[PDB]
Each structure stands twice: as structure tokens, then as C-alpha cells.
Amino acid sequence: KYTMFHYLRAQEFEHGKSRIALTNSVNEALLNPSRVYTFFSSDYVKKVNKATEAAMFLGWVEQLVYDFTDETSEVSTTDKIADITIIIPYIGPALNIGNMDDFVGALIESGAVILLEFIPEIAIPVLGTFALVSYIANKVLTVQTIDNALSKRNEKWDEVYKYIVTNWLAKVNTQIDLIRKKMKEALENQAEATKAIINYQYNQYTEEEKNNINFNIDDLSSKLNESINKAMININKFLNQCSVSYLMNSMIPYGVKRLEDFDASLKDALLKYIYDNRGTLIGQVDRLKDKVNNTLSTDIPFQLSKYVDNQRLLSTFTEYIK
Numbered sequence: 432k433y434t435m436f437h438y439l440r441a442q443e444f445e446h447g448k449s450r451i452a453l454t455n456s457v458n459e460a461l462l463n464p465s466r467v468y469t470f471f472s473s474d475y476v477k478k479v480n481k482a483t484e485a486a487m488f489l490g491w492v493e494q495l496v497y498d499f500t501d502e503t504s505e506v507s508t509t510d511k512i513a514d515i516t517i518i519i520p521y522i523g524p525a526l527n528i529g530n531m532d533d534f535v536g537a538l539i540e541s542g543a544v545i546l547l548e549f550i551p552e553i554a555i556p557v558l559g560t561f562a563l564v565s566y567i568a569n570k571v572l573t574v575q576t577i578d579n580a581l582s583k584r585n586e587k588w589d590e591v592y593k594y595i596v597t598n599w600l601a602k603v604n605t606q607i608d609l610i611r612k613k614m615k616e617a618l619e620n621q622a623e624a625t626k627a628i629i630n631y632q633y634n635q636y637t638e639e640e641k642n643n644i645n646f647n648i649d650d651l652s653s654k655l656n657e658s659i660n661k662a663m664i665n666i667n668k669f670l671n672q673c674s675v676s677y678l679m680n681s682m683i684p685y686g687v688k689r690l691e692d693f694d695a696s697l698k699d700a701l702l703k704y705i706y707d708n709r710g711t712l713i714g715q716v717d718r719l720k721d722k723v724n725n726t727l728s729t730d731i732p733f734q735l736s737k738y739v740d741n742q743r744l745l746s747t748f749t750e751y752i753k
Contacts, residue, residue, distance in 0.1 A: 433457060435548070438527045439613060441468035442620040450631050452480045453624065467624045470524035470617070471502045479628050485636050489644060495625060496654055503618065503662040511539050514676045514751055519662075519669050525617045526610065543673035544681065546610060551602035555591060555685045558693040564700055572708040577701065577719055581726050584697055588731035591686040596738045599678045607670050614666050615659070622655040667743065675735075675747040683733060694727040701727075 441460035444451050444467050453469040453476050454460050460468035469476065475498050483491045507518040518538060523529025529537040529545060537545050544550065563580050570576055626648065633646050701723045709716045735748040 433527055435526050435528070435613065437461065438468065438525065439616060439620075442617055442624070443467070444624060444627070446627075451624065451627055453628070467620075469621060469624075470521045471498075471621070474498075475502060479625065483632050485640050488633065488636075492629060492651065495629070496651075496658070499621075499625065499655065500658040500661070503658055504665060506665055507535055509535065509539070512542070512676075513680060515543065515669070515672045517665065517669050517672065519666055522610070522614065522666070522669075526613055528610070542680065543677040546670075546673055547603065547606050547677075549602070549606065551598055551682075553682060553685055555595070555689045558587065558591070558689050560693065560696045560700060563697060567701070567704050572705065572711050572719075574719075577705075577723065580697070580701060581723065584694065584727065585731060587693060588690050591690055592683070592733055593738070595682050595686045596678070596735070599674075599682055600738070603677055603682075604674055607674055611663075611667060611670050615663060618659045618662055622652070622659060626652055626655065671743040671747050675744060675751060678735075679748075679751055687730065687733075691730065694730075698723060698727045 438457060441457050445464055447464075449465050451465050451467055453471070454466045455469065455471075455473055455476055457468050460466050478498060479495060502521070505520060507520050508516060509518065510516055512518075515538065518535050520535050523534030523537070528534070531545070531548075563583055566583075567576060567580060629651070630646065630648060633641070702720060705716050705719050705723070712719075736745055739745060739748075
């Protein structure tokens with residue numbers, strides 16, 4: 432029915448003489464150049480649509496800015512979700528994300544996946560051990576032979592991580608960044624549409640009446656800009672949490688299962704290689720055995736900081752590690 436870009440158009444209007452009115456019905460917003468969509472509360476809708484006496488005008492303005500900031504800075508902190516501690520509930524209603532009708536519900540059941548319009552390729556192919564099997568095949572056993580095999584194994588873990596993180600960088604964050612980029616738009620639209628409904632009423636006030644109080648829209652718009660900045664802070668925090676969440680719970684584990692399988696196979700190989708050739712050490716190979724056993728028994732730690740210099744992403748990842 433409605434893509435993200437339609438909701439974002441429901442939230443626009445052409446400058447005109449008419450009084451424009453916010454509405455919670457998306458369909459209604461689109462079919463009328465006067466009606467504008469909002470993800471704000473029905474209480475907020477009512478409060479702006481209602482026509483306002485000249486006396487109660489500045490007091491009106493006060494409440495809307497309070498209501499704006501209340502609605503915008505909304506923050507749920509339900510901690511039923513893994514590695515997402517903050518939610519911004521109005522995101523879905525604003526961009527048709529969690530309506531793709533309970534958002535926060537949607538995150539709790541399905542995780543951060545629900546932000547992606549396009550699910551990336553998650554499967555990691557089987558990692559074979561043929562290259563190393565061939566490498567040691569009729570090689571006289573030495574310390575360096577075993578150490579090479581093990582550096583190669585390290586390198587493999589490094590390759591799979593790089594693969595996964597890059598997939599994530601390219602296909603996931605770009606998508607999420609789009610939500611961020613667009614959320615800023617939706618919020619800025621709502622500011623422009625409220626500034627419009629207000630400055631409409633004020634320009635129906637008689638000049639002697641109007642002359643009494645000065646509109647000072649550069650004050651208003653400005654106060655609306657700071658309320659948004661505060662909202663983007665919540666949104667960004669949230670988004671980066673979701674990013675690292677998806678990465679660590681829904682992407683990296685697939686690599687790690689495969690890498691573990693790889694270590695395992697390599698282990699068998701090398702230990703057999705060492706026993707088959709123990710006679711080069713007059714039969715005493717206990718150290719070499721212990722080396723491959725220790726090395727391959729522990730996963731190579733994943734450091735997001737290899738790939739990313741971002742402040743937000745790395746701290747979110749730091750929080751992940753405990």
C-alpha cells in the first residue's frame with residue numbers, strides 16, 4: 432500500500448492562505464493539500480486544530496512547544512530486547528517501518544531486523560581445509576610448518592570477520608542511516624507544519640489586537656529546532672544500538688559457527704599430521720600437539736575497532752562485550 436516515501440509526502444504541504452490541519456490518518460493527509468499527516472498523539476492533533484482566541488494565544492504557543500518536545504523526546508526503555516535498551520516508539524508510525532500496528536512490540540519479537548527493507552545475505556559458506564591439507568601433505572614436519580598452518584587459520588578468521596563487517600557496513604548501516612536521515616526530515620516537517628498552523632491564526636488577529644503581542648517566529652522556529660536536536664540524539668542512540676545489535680546477534684554468529692567448524696577440521700588434520708610424522712622427533716611430539724590444541728580451542732576475538740573509527744558504534748560495541 433504505502434512505502435516509506437509516501438508517509439514522508441503525507442507530511443508535506445504547499446504554502447497557502449488556507450488553514451492547514453494535522454491528521455492521524457495517512458490516507459486523508461495525501462488526498463488533501465491542506466491536511467498534513469502526523470505520528471503525534473490524537474491529543475496533539477486536537478490541540479492544534481482548535482481555533483484560538485487572541486488572549487490565549489501565547490499560552491497556546493507555550494503548550495504546543497511543550498507538547499512537541501514531549502512527543503518528540505518520547506523514549507521507552509523496556510529491556511526485554513537483547514542489546515537494545517532504548518526505543519523510540521514513534522519511528523514506525525512516522526515512516527511506515529513497524530507497520531510493514533505495534534512497533535515496540537515488533538522490535539521485541541523480531542529484533543532489529545525490522546528496520547531493514549532489504550535483508551542482506553547472511554549465510555556464510557562452508558570453510559574448507561583443503562589448502563592446508565595440501566600444504567602439509569608431504570611436507571617434512573617442523574615448527575614453522577605448524578606455525579604457518581596456524582597463522583593461516585588466524586588469517587581465515589580475520590577474513591570472515593572482514594567479510595561480515597563489510598556486508599554489514601554496506602547493506603545494513605546504509606539502510607539504517609536512511610531512517611536516521613529521514614527521521615530528521617519527518618521531524619523538520621512537523622516543525623514547519625506547526626509553525627504554519629500557528630502563524631495562520633496570528634494573521635487573523637486585528638492589528639491593534641495583533642500589535643499588542645509580537646509573534647517572534649525566529650524565537651519559535653528556533654525553539655523547535657533545539658527540541659528536534661534533542662530527539663535526534665535519542666534516535667541516533669537508538670539506531671546505533673540496533674546496528675551493533677544486528678551485527679552481533681544476526682550476522683557475526685553465522686561466521687563463527689563456520690570458523691569453529693573449520694578449527695575443528697584443521698585440528699584433526701594437524702594432529703594426525705603430527706602423529707603420522709612423530710618419528711622426526713624420535714616420537715616425542717607432545718609440545719606440538721599441545722600447541723595446536725590450545726590454539727584451536729579458542730576463538731579469535733572479534734574487534735569492531737579494526738573496521739570502524741566511529742565513536743557511537745564502538746562504545747555500543749563495548750557495551751556488548753560484557
